[PDB]
């Protein structure tokens, strides 16, 4: 997956996240391949990633920018409440491509 | 989208030009631009700010930057914003800077 | 799906969201096609997207403008509470077109 | 469905919502036809939309003016709390006209 | 149903709600007829609307004056909490006249 | 049912509610007759309304003075919380007179 | 039931509630007679109301002085929270005299 | 039951409650007799009220000094929260003397 | 049970509660005798109250100093929350002496 | 119905007429009309407003409009409402404008 | 019962009588009566009201009536109640009027 | 037990005796006694009461009684308590009277 | 059980509780004997109280210093929240010595 | 168990708790022996206390420094919330040594 | 352990010695000792205490004792604590006494 | 796993966490190997850690930077709420490689 | 287990905890050995502690620095909320090495 | 990690050097260093601190240490921090010390 395409899908304009995305996006692609037991290879032997895997990879890369051991944070006038799990509607994007392990 | 910083402001400094015989002319020139959120003070903060010699009009929230100085100026929506007091880094964590300011008429430029 | 028609369905007048929508709308169309196992093709072989799929694509593109790792936010006069899942009344915009996988 | 009739049913007097309603109302009519599996055609071959479909279309068009990824919002002295799902009493207007898919 | 009789049942004295009521009341009468599967006709073929249907039509017309996508609102001294469903004691104003569909 | 008797049962002294009560009380009497399937007619063919029906009609007429789409309201220093359903102890006044539909 | 005896049971000294009690007490006596299916008659044919019916009539008349559509109220220094149902310990005052309907 | 004995059991020293207690205490004695189906008569034909009935009568007379339709009350700096039912530990005082109805 | 021994078990030094305790303690002793169906008599026919009954009588006499119709109270600097039932660990102070009724 | 803005107000400006020889006459003429909500200040805000040289009587909430100026005037229910301070756009989001004002007698017209 | 308005108050105006030669005598005469709730101010409001030139004693809540004027007077429980400021309609909704006032001795009549 | 009013206070008036030639002697004599609760003011109310010309020391809560006058005095625990201001009936409901007062030395008697 | 040993186990240094402990501790010893059905007598006929009974007696004597009818109390700046039942971990100290009643 | 070793396990440096610990530690050792039905004796008959009995004795001695009748306390700047039961992870330290009673 | 009163303080009075010719020497001598909790005032109470002629430094909580007088002194951790105002028994219930005080230098002894 | 790759996955730029990560990362690698019963070895006998184990090791090392005995903390402007368990979506990263123990 | 290795795993730099860790760490090693029924001895008879036991010992030693009878604490501007039990994700580190008792 | 004390500050004393003929030179020399958290005051605390003769800029939280004196100085991030008032031990429990201070320009060294 192209890094600039993920930045367009998450509406990021600066380059503050480029070092993180360059590491995180190929790992999430390989995890979609291992979790679905599906190499995503078309008729002609070529890798062809479906659209739902792309939505899943972009949204999971956005989710994993948080801190893992933190639920809420407050700093004078600003405050944040964080999600603890990946939501089920993002995890259900991988559902139409699931095969069984052999 | 729901951005923390939906505005764009310009920071200006008061610098000297000298050319030819002896010159004292100082000009407000641009330093840099940044994403920000410019908010008017709340209904409760208004009555507290009315008991000051220079009453406060705006709170400006911006990401942390050590180039921001207390003698600077802000251009925002065609208006000049003058700083009141010293810039504050929230909780000392070097993430978000808050500046207090007031409107000072229109800007030409 | 036309981008200007999506902007009319979501009451957007400016061009702030154009680069996100140009990337996100065709991915959601292909996800509806893969999730219903339905290519949405009429008698003459032409692609005819149903109205309920169009409502779903517009509302899901509006939902995915949020940050995935955030449930709440506050700055000094403003505060926001975000929805964590797509509501079931939007997910039920795919139901009358569902086929089984072959 | 006529747009001015919907504006009378929702107590709208200005023209701030006209571009949205002109897009959204025919899509909701076609979705009621697909959801009930009913073309709403009388004896003489003419389209005759029943009253409950009209109530459903007006109330669903009013519901979809909200933002899909937001449950609450605050701005100085004003605040809003939003509904997450379409209520069951609006969805139950389509119940007396439901047929089975063939 | 007469509009002035509905205004007497809901304690309305001015003419602010007249254009909404003129559109909404006959639609609710036809919805009661379709939902009970009962045309409400006496011995001589004359239309005779029962009293409980009239109470239901007036209270449902009062309920649907709210905004469908809003559960609460507040402006600086005023605040409002809205009901999201029609109460079951108003929905039970159709029960002694219910017939089966043919 | 006499209107002045209902006003004595609800502790009303002025005439602000007379136009509402004159409309609402006969409709509630006919609804009690339809809900119990009982014409309330004694030995000599005369209409004889029992005491529990009178308590039910007075308390239901007091309940229906509220606004149907509102659960709470605040105005500077005054506030109100409203009941959403008719309580079961008022509905159980009609229980000793219930017959079956023929 | 004597009205002055009810006023002694409820610790009422003035005459503010006299017109309400004169209307409400005999209706509650007839409701207890109809709800227990018991005319409360001794050996000589004389009406002998038991102590339980008297306690129940007094407490139910005190309960029905509230507004039926209100659960809470507040004005600037004063506030009230109301009970929505008659408590079961007052309803269990009628239990030792219950007969079956014939 | 003696009224001064009840006043000693409830720690009352003035005479503000005497008119209420003189009415309420014999009614509660007769209700204990009707609820237990027990006349409380010893070997020699004499009425002999047991100790648990006396505790029950005193505590129920203290409970019924409240207002029946009120759960909470506030008046400037003072506030009160009231019990809605008689507690089970007071009602269980009548348990060792219960007989069956004949 | 001796009143001064009860005052030593409850850490009472003054004589403010003497008139209440002189009335309440023998009633609780007779209630324990009737509730366990046990007259508490040794070999020589002498009354021997067990220690657990004594703990129960003292703690129940301390519990019944509260007002039965009140769960909470507040006056300007003071506030109180009261227990509504006798706790089960005090009610279990009768269990090893329980016999069946004959 | 439960409208956020149940009132109708009139905005007025102070403009010049000149005709014939030389003229200085200025007239309050209407600019536009808008839906609004005019609220008296709360019981707690009253004691805070009494410690000002010009005490505030009303808060006016209206939808956002950039034609509204601090030298304008409001006609409401046959009364003149005079502005106190500058109009405030809530949180800088350009949705709702709040104006503070005071009553200034009856209006003829 | 639990009435919102358990009291009965009398509103009075200061009107002129003239009879016979030339007369200046003004009398407080009754206008109308209404149901109301007269409440003393709270414990926290007392310390705020002590820092005023005319301290407030009572808040009077009544149903909305456009006959009520700021130059009027209230008779309540044999005492005279004098208005402080202008009557306020709560949130502009025309349902409940609040009046602030103070006690001014006994009434004869 | 948990009494609302655990104390006993004495109310005193300032009345005249005259015997024999012409006499001006006024004596504080007892009027009646009542159950009450005498509370010192809270930690937050102390700083508000320090900005008054006569600072308040005690709040006295008693059942409602129309014999209580603002020129009276209270004897409590061998001390004299002097009234500050007028007695207040809470919310106008005629149930509980609150009196503000201060200590004025020891009582002989 | 020695009173000074209990005072060392509860960290009490003054003599404010001595009159209470001298009464309460032998009653709790005899109640542990009656509750376990165990006289705690060794080989040589001598009373030998086990360690868990000693922990139970000290902690139950500390628990019973509270007021039985109070769950919470506030006094200006100080406040207290009380336990309603003896905790299960203190009651489970008597478990290894339980015999059956004969 | 040595008292100084318990003070090292609980991070205690002063001698404020010495008199309580000298009484409480051997009682908890004997309670572990009685509750596991295990005398903790090696091959040569020597007493060998396992590591988990030591951890349990130290943590239970720290737990029992609280007041048994108190769940919360507050004084003007300080406040405390107390645990009411021993946690199950401390009680599960005795599990690998449990034998059956004989 | 979690004691309500973890400190130990000493109460001192200002008493006279006279020996031999005529003497005026007054000495601070100890009266008694008690368990207590000495707390500095909170962050919000600091700004309220700065607007007094004698600012408060400490709140002292002790069990109720009628020997405590307003002219006494406290020795605590080698420092002298001087009373400000009168001792307060909380809510009149005679359980806990609160004293306000300030530090007055080191103690010799 | 390389420490600099973990620092790129967690958006860490300084060297404040280097000594913790150098100790914690290889322990988590061996824990994944023991918990999946999988040595992660390819055809040629070389160790090949999958992408899932890498994501899991990085997120678990970020989780274990918190204090284990703390759920919340606050200092005067700053406040934190901590997560008490590792989320299940991080634990499900090890699922596609699980083997059974032999 | 080495004490300096545990200090590196818990990010401790000073020597304030050294006396506690020197006592607590060997006891937790022996508890892991007895709870898993596993001496952790390799082929050559040498003790070889696995990685998950090391993670468990470090995190349990960090957890047991809290006070056992305290769930929350407040001191002017600072406050703390404590965990009551060891979390299940720390206890599940011992799971891959569990044997049965012999 | 999430440290309570993420900063490092330096404490300085004002001590005397004397060498050779007679000398009055006093130098600020370092005493010790400690972990701390230096926080600017909150938005609500700003308006309270503006009504003082020396306004407060920073709150410094540090672990408890009895070497800290009110005549000391703090070096933090190349700036001098001057103490305002006396250091406070929170609730008298000897765990955390809070110091109030203000910025006093740059430090050389």
């Amino acid at each position: 997956m192209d890094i600039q395409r993920v930045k367009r899908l998450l509406s990021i304009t600066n380059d503050k996240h480029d070092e993180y995305l360059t590491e995180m996006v190929p790992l999430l692609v390989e995890f979609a391949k291992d979790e679905c037991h599906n190499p995503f290879i078309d008729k002609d032997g070529n890798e062809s990633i479906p659209s739902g895997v792309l939505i899943f990879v972009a949204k999971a890369a956005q989710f994993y920018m948080t801190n893992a051991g933190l639920t809420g944070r407050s700093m004078d006038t600003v405050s944040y409440n964080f999600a603890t799990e990946i939501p089920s509607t993002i995890l259900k994007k991988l559902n139409p491509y699931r095969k069984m392990a052999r | 989208m729901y951005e923390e910083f939906p505005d764009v402001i310009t920071f200006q400094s008061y610098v000297e030009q000298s050319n030819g015989e002896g010159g004292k002319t100082y000009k407000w020139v641009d330093e840099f631009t940044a994403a920000a959120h410019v908010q008017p003070i709340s209904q409760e903060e208004y009555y507290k700010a009315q008991q000051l010699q220079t009453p406060i009009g705006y709170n400006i929230y911006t990401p942390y930057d050590d180039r921001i100085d207390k003698k600077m100026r802000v251009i925002y929506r065609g208006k000049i914003v003058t700083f009141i007091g010293d810039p504050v880094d929230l909780s000392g964590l070097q993430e978000i800077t808050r500046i207090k300011g007031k409107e000072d008429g229109a800007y030409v430029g």
Side-chain angles (χ1 to χ4, degrees), chain A, chain B:
Chain A
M1 196 166 185
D2 180 32
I3 287 305
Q4 304 299 319
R5 195 184 184 186
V6 178
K7 275 163 71 171
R8 287 193 299 274
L9 277 163
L10 300 180
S11 68
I12 299 172
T13 60
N14 47 50
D15 61 327
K16 267 82 171 180
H17 308 92
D18 282 20
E19 182 197 354
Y20 162 75
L21 287 170
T22 311
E23 267 289 316
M24 182 48 96
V25 170
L27 294 186
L28 288 171
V29 171
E30 302 308 305
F31 181 81
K33 279 167 190 186
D34 297 332
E35 163 78 28
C36 292
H37 301 291
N38 199 331
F40 304 130
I41 282 163
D42 49 40
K43 299 179 187 293
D44 291 78
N46 298 305
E47 177 179 319
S48 181
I49 307 297
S51 64
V53 180
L54 303 160
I55 296 174
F56 171 73
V57 163
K59 291 318 268 196
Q62 195 185 58
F63 180 85
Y64 278 128
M65 291 182 187
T66 51
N67 209 280
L70 209 66
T71 309
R73 200 167 70 87
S74 181
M75 175 188 39
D76 198 2
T77 53
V78 192
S79 50
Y80 305 105
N81 289 287
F82 304 106
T84 78
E85 315 271 346
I86 295 184
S88 296
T89 53
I90 296 178
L91 296 167
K92 278 310 171 181
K93 302 284 166 177
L94 302 176
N95 217 52
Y97 318 108
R98 286 168 47 86
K99 300 173 168 170
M100 290 166 127
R102 285 183 186 181
Chain B
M1 281 78 79
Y2 290 108
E3 300 93 329
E4 280 190 271
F5 304 108
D7 302 331
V8 162
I9 55 166
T10 313
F11 283 92
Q12 282 197 341
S13 276
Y14 194 53
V15 204
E16 177 71 358
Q17 285 71 223
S18 298
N19 282 312
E21 68 279 19
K24 303 283 102 174
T25 177
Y26 287 95
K27 179 165 43 150
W28 288 101
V29 309
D30 303 355
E31 293 291 318
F32 51 106
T33 45
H37 195 185
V38 185
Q39 293 180 28
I41 64 173
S42 66
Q43 186 173 355
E44 291 83 4
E45 181 165 350
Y46 176 82
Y47 292 101
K48 295 190 281 193
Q50 288 318 298
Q51 327 167 23
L52 311 167
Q53 42 163 330
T54 308
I56 300 165
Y58 297 95
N59 285 318
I60 305 174
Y61 292 91
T62 194
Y64 176 76
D65 205 304
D66 45 61
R67 291 179 286 167
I68 302 165
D69 181 88
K70 70 185 290 205
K71 297 175 311 305
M72 280 173 143
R73 209 174 66 151
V74 157
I75 303 301
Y76 163 71
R77 278 191 189 156
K79 291 293 182 182
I80 300 170
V81 184
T82 303
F83 290 178
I84 301 176
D86 193 75
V88 173
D89 169 42
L90 299 193
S91 306
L93 304 167
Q94 303 176 286
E95 300 188 14
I96 299 178
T97 297
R98 178 176 61 221
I99 317 161
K100 306 176 290 281
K102 55 174 263 200
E103 185 181 1
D104 264 350
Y107 181 61
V108 288

